[PDB]
Amino acid sequence: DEGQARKSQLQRRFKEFLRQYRVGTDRTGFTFKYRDELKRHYNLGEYWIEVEMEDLASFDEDLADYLYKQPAEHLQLLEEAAKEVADEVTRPRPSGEEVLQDIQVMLKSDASPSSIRSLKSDMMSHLVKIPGIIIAASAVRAKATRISIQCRSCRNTLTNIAMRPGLEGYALPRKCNTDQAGRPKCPLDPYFIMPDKCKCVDFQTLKLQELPDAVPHGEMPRHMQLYCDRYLCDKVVPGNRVTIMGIYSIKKFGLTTSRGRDRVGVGIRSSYIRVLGIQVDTDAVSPQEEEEFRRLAALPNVYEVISKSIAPSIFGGTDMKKAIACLLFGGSRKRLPDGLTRRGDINLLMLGDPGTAKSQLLKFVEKCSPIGVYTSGKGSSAAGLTASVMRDPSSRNFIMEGGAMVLADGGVVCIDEFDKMREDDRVAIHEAMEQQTISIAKAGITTTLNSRCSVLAAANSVFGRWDETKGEDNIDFMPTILSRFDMIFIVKDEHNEERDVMLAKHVITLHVSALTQTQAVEGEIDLAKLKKFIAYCRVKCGPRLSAEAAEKLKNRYIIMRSGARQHERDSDRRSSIPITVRQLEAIVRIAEALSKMKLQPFATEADVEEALRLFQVSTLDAAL
Amino acid sequence: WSLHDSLCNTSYTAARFKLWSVHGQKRLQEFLADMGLPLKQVKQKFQAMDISLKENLREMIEESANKFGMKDMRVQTFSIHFGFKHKFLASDVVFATMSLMESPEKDGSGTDHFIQALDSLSRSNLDKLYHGLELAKKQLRATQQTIASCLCTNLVISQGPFLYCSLMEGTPDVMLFSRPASLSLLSKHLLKSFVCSTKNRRCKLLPLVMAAPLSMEHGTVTVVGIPPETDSSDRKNFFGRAFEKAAESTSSRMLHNHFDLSVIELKAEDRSKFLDALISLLS
Amino acid sequence: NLEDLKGHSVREWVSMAGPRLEIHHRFKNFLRTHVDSHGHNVFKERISDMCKENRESLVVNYEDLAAREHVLAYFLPEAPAELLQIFDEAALEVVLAMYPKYDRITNHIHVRISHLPLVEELRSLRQLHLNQLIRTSGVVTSCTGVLPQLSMVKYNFVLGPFCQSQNQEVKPEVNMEETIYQNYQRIRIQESPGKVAAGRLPRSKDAILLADLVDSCKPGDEIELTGIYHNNYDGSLNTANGFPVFATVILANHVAKKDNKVAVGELTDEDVKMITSLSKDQQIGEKIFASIAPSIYGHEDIKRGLALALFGGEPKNPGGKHKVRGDINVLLCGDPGTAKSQFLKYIEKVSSRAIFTTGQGASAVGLTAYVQRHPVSREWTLEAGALVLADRGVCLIDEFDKMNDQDRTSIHEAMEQQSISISKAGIVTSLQARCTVIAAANPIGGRYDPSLTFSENVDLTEPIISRFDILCVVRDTVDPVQDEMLARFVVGSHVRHHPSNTYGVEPLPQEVLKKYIIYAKERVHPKLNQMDQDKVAKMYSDLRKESMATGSIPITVRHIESMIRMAEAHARIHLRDYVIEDDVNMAIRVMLESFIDTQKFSVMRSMRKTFARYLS
DNA sequence: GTGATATCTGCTTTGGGTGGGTGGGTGGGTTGAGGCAATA
DNA sequence: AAGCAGATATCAC
Ligand SMILES: Nc1ncnc2c1ncn2[C@@H]1O[C@H](COP(=O)(O)OP(=O)(O)OP(=O)(O)O)[C@@H](O)[C@H]1O
Ligand SMILES: Nc1ncnc2c1ncn2[C@@H]1O[C@H](COP(=O)(O)OP(=O)(O)O)[C@@H](O)[C@H]1O
Ligand SMILES: [K+]
Ligand SMILES: [K+]
Ligand SMILES: [Mg+2]
Ligand SMILES: [Mg+2]
Ligand SMILES: [Zn+2]
Structure with a gap:
């Protein structure tokens, strides 16, 4: 009885809290928040x-x-x-x-x-x-x-x-x-x-x-x-x-x-x-956030704003920061009537000299991506990257556990030290990078998983630093893996008096500023908002090329193929960097990513022009 | 805020505990142990802290502070309550309004910062008041960091008649103290800390002159002067006329734009020259 | 008299009221009145430190208790449980007397005994040690999580309180809300590999940690363990053996890492006074440099670099999105028989957390982290390697050039990003590895050739070489005067260190240096507020110009950040809370002197002339 | 009326995965795939 | 269902 009375009194007090609680002021108004x-x-x-x-x-x-x-x-x-x-x-x-x-x-x-x-x-x-x-x-x-x-x-x-x-x-x-x-x-x-x-x-x-x-x-x-x-x-x-x-x-x-x-x-x-x-x-997404995202997408210089917001602590690398932005947004995945799929994800490889912030870029993209996994090539295995077969302790039966590219499905997987990976482990990623599935036939399990992720890889050259005399010996990767990368950046640590002085002042100021209390920057987007903006755009907008943009792309692709073919004939050596149909579809993906930033249903000729400029600076430069 | 954060960022307790030092933290720990407050409770936000500790908090804090050499822990003030939630002390509102007005967010002009501050004083714009409270927390932390940097490096040097401290562009938070009002308040807090933490008896009875960069384009520096810090000070300031008399005698390029005559704008190159005149004028 | 037992055991004697009260009073008096050599009240400071940190354990040194209360010291090993309970009660009384409000923080004070003279090996424990206070040592091989154990039980009307012992289930459902719990941990302690005879299986014991004793140690640790040797009936043991054999366990009272290690908390006020007074000395930097391996004839650059690496820089993360390491990595490379291994061994001996490994004895996964297979639980688990275990410590690698290339490439991520990333067997994770790497290598052909450059002498490539903040070249040149000096130093060293028994400054004693280092790494965080940006920027451009012309070593942005670490480390050596100009100048000199040493002999004169203005 | 001694009652067993992997594999369970060190 | 531990009523002397 007494315990019942105490319980009833406490329940009554909770009920009164729920009935009577209000938010507001007598100047504005009042709302019965919890009751409503x-x-x-x-x-x-x-x-x-x-x-x-x-x-x-x-x-x-x-x-x-x-x-x-x-x-x-x-x-x-x-x-x-x-x-x-x-x-x-x-x-x-x-x-x-x-x-x-x-x-x-x-x-x-x-x-x-x-x-x-x-x-x-x-x-x-x-x-x-x-x-x-x-x-x-x-x-x-x-x-x-x-x-x-x-x-x-x-x-x-x-x-x-x-x-x-x-x-x-x-x-x-x-x-x-x-x-x-x-x-x-x-x-x-x-x-x-x-x-x-x-x-x-x-x-x-x-x-x-x-x-x-x-x-x-x-x-x-x-x-x-x-x-x-x-x-x-x-x-x-x-x-x-x-x-x-x-x-x-x-x-x-x-x-x-x-x-x-x-x-x-x-x-x-x-x-x-x-x-x-x-x-x-x-x-x-709250309606206030959605309105703010629409405002960002409509800025005439939104592409510049997003690029400036990617790893703002790194001193330069403007072209590599522009390509990473495209990778973060991605292209449009498509399924044709016959059932064959075309992937919309973008793969990017940074191959270059030591101490050029390649690892710092990968760490940033891990934080910035809505879904992001950071791994090391040295510390990975074929089963670890895709998926593993193992015994369940409770059931006494075989089960499946997903790897990095299952955990990163729908996002980005950053593979650092890509050159240190074993060849047998590297080869296990070919299917996931293009078909975006993982096929398993082991221990009585025959299944297929989804691995729709973007690969962002970093590596060093064969001799540590890129040697211009060695030529094609600088690259060790097979043509099969290299053709699966939309953009390949050869990063060379160029020594110049003027740039080196600027970089040193930037780095010192960065270390002194670590004490400064954090402040906003007018021309950038904070990581938290940029992360939400990326997720919003990927769900809302899948662009397509316009008929006029397709004609421009077709003609430039033919020229690019002839130039690559001529270059190999003159050099008498088949180049390490191939130019295939995959590279044509890569330019389509990059153009669609640029449109997706602006929430535009159709990619224009300017989008293709920028996509071709990015390809020129990245992969054609490597191939020639 | 949390009781720990409040104790660390209040110029009174922060100055008397010498929290910029290494032994000050130990002294603060001894104070809290004398209180009997668990560390995890004092480090929790005051609202979330267990109510049993709040019953006699003011009296126990006063007693412990009395044991530790602080006799002025308690002040007569006012509080305002409305609704179920909203309760404010007067000094909290003052700090929030000041932080809204002297905000370092330069996306908005100072007439824009004035409008925000004026709006915050109306109960319809309560969100602005809470935003100002957050800004005030940031400003207090910055003030304590700057005071620590100045006192640890011995940047407060005594000329004959007055103490001189100058902020440099290498200082991290210097931007937060370029505006004259922020610089004046910082200089007063710095003088209180210095007087608490110095050994020389003469340097305790001196006024302070403080300079900070204003514009890197014109090479201008803001200069402020404040009188000696004493418990019974009449709060009277003689630096406006002294500045005007030094500038006239030396022919420096000074600008009086603040409504207070003790805040001036000076051409950086003239600075050195100016100071000597000031010295000769006050000694 | 307390000593005289009227035909009882010690347990019986201390169980009755008279002797119990006498013991309580004696222990309280000991706590209140015990003073050290200088005359300071030891326990007044110890209790103040305990209460300021809101801790619940008071540590008592057995030797002090024996000196002041010999009868209590004699009783303690024979009836440990009862004596420890009495000590706990007296300690609580004294603490509440000193801090009357402390009862809100805790209701129990644990008395823990250190420096117990009765040391035993794990192999030597016999039935005569049962129910005694013993001290042993070993390696932690297995460790549970912290688990809740019943202490004062209540049952559902609600039954009265019931105490719980370590040996049987109590005999009255449990009421979770009204019950009292305690922290429980079980560790397995094993014979240290250096103490077990080669080819023999080690012996092991189980230990139980309770209350605030939990998390006192981690797997892989070298520990000294003081506790109660306890036995209890076990049916399945009896079944197994066919004889009535009892299970054994150690009820832990005190856990220490005792391989010459003192924690920042254990430093006393007098220790801090001495450290500060030392830091006031004008030549403290030289004295600390001279303290690095005093039994080696001068290699003054190596000692300076090793001191800087020991003290370390300051990690930074400006806005939470850009991490920069604070550790300083060192590479020694030079002629055979120049004491490189002795330097590494000294660093291992002086550091608090150091792991030493050599050449082909280190594997890739053993250095970073490995995947352990199991026959019965979850199949696969992740286990820490050398770099993970040495987090916030030192990893020393000898015969660095003799490593397998695949094993040497496994440290790249840890050396810069200070983490290990593993994606194996269903495990996708990253572990912290923030350790200073100090490596020693021999040049190609076993002799350093002055006619070549450093890059030509070694087989290491640019990516690994750039990860080393300080590069030291050890050269063995034939000079009669230097040879005589070295011979006279080495023979004098062999005379001085008989078991029967350059800077111009007296080095610090090694114990003093260890205290100094721990204080500076824990209580000093130097801040980089101002710096001559133009001078550093101009210097960096000049260095990159010369490096490209000669090719002696690669120069990267990492070389700028190394200078900032070295300036921070130099300021930390002086116990300065802000880096000043003289720290930056010293860091510049250290970097430029290293760079000049990597040049060919002919070019060395020109390089000093090029950078003379800085080296001044 | 006390000492057997015959009757009755309640517990839990089994190996098993709804009883855990925060019990442990020195308490005991085939098949295959997956990391290591040593290997060639 | 099968068997040991515990409880308990019951014959016998
Ligand atoms: N352009 C730059 N701007 C700012 N910081 C830089 C720049 N380049 C390098 N750094 C800094 O220098 C260090 C370079 O190390 P990092 O791991 O990023 O290099 P990396 O190019 O990935 O090298 P490696 O190929 O040797 O792994 C980091 O501290 C990075 O912050
Ligand atoms: N400069 C020196 N001063 C004192 N002892 C030295 C010196 N150089 C070498 N030694 C001695 O020579 C021995 C061999 O040195 P070692 O550690 O093998 O060097 P390394 O590994 O470079 O060959 C050591 O025991 C060391 O004490
Ligand atoms: K089992
Ligand atoms: K079981
Ligand atoms: Mg890297
Ligand atoms: Mg050696
Ligand atoms: Zn029924």
Whole structure:
């Protein structure tokens, strides 16, 4: 009774918070924020809301303190209050919407996060805020919220038994409640779960790795298990950087020591986090963002603005920064009626001298790309890059795990030290670079995966520094791999008095400026916005060449082929850099990328002119 | 903000703890230990901090500060509350408005920065006030960094009658202190820190003259003068007339454009010359 | 009298109330009154340091306790659990007396014993050590995550509190909210490879770490472990052996990395006073240079470069999108028998975290990171190599020219981007590797030819050579005066270091230098605020002009950033929080002197003349 | 009326992957593909 | 279903 009274009072306070909370001022106006959000979400068929802890503290500090210290009970009370308020906001309801739905209440806060390493025993059963990286996600499974049980002998049924949230089970009644007289006694453990009477929700399990910068020196990164349910399920994927609010909890399995439990230490338990809210970190588009993106795409010098924003810390490399912008946006993937596909992704290779910021460029593109994976050729294998076959520990069966080019599907994979890769490992990438699939036939698995990613590779020349006398001996790659690159840049560290003085002053100023507090630059776009702008354009615009632009491209391609053919004849050596139909389609992709920057449905002659200029400076220069 | 950040970026406590030094951090840790506040709590944002610690915070801070040689930790002021959320102390509003007005974001002119500051004072433009609070945090951090750079390198050199500190273009945050009001406030904070952290008794009773670059095209420098820092100072300043008398006697190219006569614009080449006259005038 | 036992064991004696109270009072008095040689209250400073950092452990040196409380010292090894509990209670009383509000931070203080005189090997532990306080040493081979263990249990009405021991399940469902937990960790300790006889299988023990003791060590660490040797009945052991054999474990009390290592926290106020006073000296740079391998006749450029590499530069990341390393890599190359290996061994001995490896003994994955196969769990896992294990440390590579080329190319990413990227067997990840690489190599043909350039003498190519901030050429020239000086120094060194027993400045003692280095790397972060950009820019252009003309070595932008690291390292040696002009001048001189040494003998005179203005 | 001694009751077993890989492979499970070091 | 551990009522002397 007294406990019931206390619970009812707390639920009433949560209900009043939901009914009365307001944002605004008497000069402007007022909005009942949470009541309105609940009403709109329920009408949309989305039975969840997100509540800020600061708002709750503003309304009632004690309620927020209780929610922080004892999250489970008070969160249950808050959900019941949310259900009550959802009935009142929507209470006269249309036919087929009679039954009131449960409301999931998500939690959000402005507090500073805490690390995995800082999670101690004294914080058990508390509300915690943790940053990390998603490294693994399980399949979506069913978790019972309500069960009905029936007696084997007498068919006596107990219905609507509530289940605990999280990774917690239930202990069935030991004995039945039927009358002792007349009937032979019911057997021990008489109850079984009725399949069709059970109410279930979707659940998921995740692994959260600590942030790379938080790892103590010389230690392998640690991870933690996450439990997600209902609308939190299937929100994040491996590779996402997130901040999670949750309950630090313990797995509650059977009390019995079944199979003769024989742990290496006594009284140990398994920890996990019961997730109450997820926030994806930058490192859907609001209408304000969409309007801002449309404004950027319409700037007459948008191409210059984007190029200036790519690795602004690097001193020069304007042509290579322009080509990287095209790679980030990409071309238009197409499927012809016969079923054959033409890829829209752009591949770029930087081959050149040491200390020319090739690795710094690759690191930037990893941060800038909406989907980006950085790997090293030396530290890679054929199975690691594409996909692997291995034994599943639980099932005792063969499974498949994706490599770098599966994790980078839909984005960019940056392969540094490309020359150090073994020939057998390099050759495993040919199919993925052109057909954009990975074919596997191993250990009884015959399947095909998607690998629609752009390759950005860096390498050194054969003799360390490019030697003009050695000629074609500077390049070691086969013609097959080189023909799969849209643009090939030969980077030569040219020594000049005037440029060297300018570069040195830039580098010194860069090191001194590390102390300066960060400031915006008028002519550039910050990385966070550029990252979002790229993602928006790739989903919204797939351009095509205009009929006039195609005629211009056709005529220049024929000239380029004749010049390459003539050059090989005169030199008596077949050139290392080939000029094939793939290079014609490469120019099409680069032209479409330039249009996609401007959100233009058709690529013009100016787009083809710029695409041909980029090709001239990159690949024709290498080939001649 | 967080209590730790507030303690580190308040010129009063930052000057008395000598947080620009290596032993100042240890002294701050000792202060917090005397309070009994867990480090993780004081490093958390004040709003998110556990309410049990907030019950007697002002009294306990006053007592601990009294033990540590700060007797003026408490000031009489005012606060304004509206809504469920909105609560502000007067000094917070002052700092936010100042930061909006003296913003370093040069995309907007100074008449544009004035308009933002004026708008922020109306409750309809609350978002501007919060933005100004963030800008104020950045400005306070920059001020402490500049003070540390000046005090650690011994850039405050005593001429006979006054102390002289000059900012150079190599300084990282110099841009944030090119505007005269920011330079004046920085000079006052710097003098307070210097007086707290110096050994010479004479240098504690001196006024300060501070210079910072204004325009690299015309070679102009902003010069400010402030009086000695004392607990009972009458807050009276004699540097405007002294500057006008030095410039006249030496024939330098000075401009009086600020409404305060102690802020001047000087041709950099004349600077040296100017100063000598000033010295001879005040000694 | 406490010493006199009326026919009880020590455990029984300390279990009863009278002796318990006497022990409590004696330990409290020891904490309150113990003073060092100078007369300073040791535990007043130790407790202040503990509380300022919000820590829960008080470390007691066994020798001090034995000197002041000999009876308690005698009791401690025989009845460790009871004595340690009493010590914990007394320590909590004293701490709360000094800091009455500390009870909000913690309710328990752990007393941890160091310098226990009863050292034993893992192989030597016998049944007579059971339930005693023992000190052993070894290698951490396996380490669990930090796990929650029941401490004070509550059951569902809700049952009364129940304590949990390390040996059996308690006998009353558990109430998660009302229960109390503790941090738990299990480590496996193994015989160090240098102590096990060749061809023999090492011995191993298990250890349990509790509360704030967790995460005190990592796999691969050399540790000294003080704890309680504990045995418990195990049925499956009995089954296996056919005899009633009990399982054993170490209940850890104190974990130290004791291979001559002192942490920044362990430095005392007097130590910092001495370090600061030393830094005030006008010749401190020369004294620190002279402290590098004092038993080597002068190779003054090598010692200077190694000191700079030891102190290190400052990492920078201007806007979070442009990372620049702060580490300084060194390459020694010269004639045989010039003490290159001795320099590397000295660096290994003086550094806090150093890994030494040689030539063909290092493989590509062993240096960076490797993929371990398993028969039963997840098939594939990622494990740290030398560079990962030496993160924020030093990796020394001897016989650098004798390495396999494929193995030598595996350090390129770690030397510049300071990370290792692995994409293997379903693992796609990057690990931190921020380590100073110091390598020693021999020239082509085993002799450095002065008629050639450095690039002609070695088989290394431009990409690897550019990753080395400092290049040192060691030349063995025949000069009668120098030969006599070297002979008289070496024979005197053999006289001085009999087991029975150039700068012109007295070097620092090695223990003093180790304290100085740790303080500077932890408490000093020199800032580059101002620099003569024109002088540095003009110098860089001149260097690139001469490098292209002669081809002695490649010059890249990396050479500008190395100068800034060297200026920062020089300022750190002086405990300066801001880099000044004399740091930049020293860094310029170091870089120009190195460049001139890479020229042919004929060109060397012209090169000094070209850069004379800087070298002045 | 106490000491067997006969009857009755509840536990958990099996090897198994909805019981974990945050138990451990010195507690015990074919087949193939995938990294290493040594190899040629 | 099969078997050991525990509980307990029951004959016998
Ligand atoms: N043009 C430049 N502007 C600014 N910084 C530069 C420039 N070129 C090089 N750097 C800096 O110099 C160093 C060059 O190292 P980096 O790893 O980027 O070179 P790399 O060209 O990839 O060389 P390698 O082929 O040897 O791997 C980095 O610190 C980079 O920031
Ligand atoms: N300059 C020197 N001063 C003192 N000892 C030296 C010197 N040069 C060589 N030695 C001694 O010669 C021995 C061989 O040197 P070593 O370490 O093998 O050099 P390297 O590896 O360059 O051949 C060492 O034991 C070292 O003590
Ligand atoms: K098992
Ligand atoms: K198993
Ligand atoms: Mg590189
Ligand atoms: Mg050697
Ligand atoms: Zn029944």
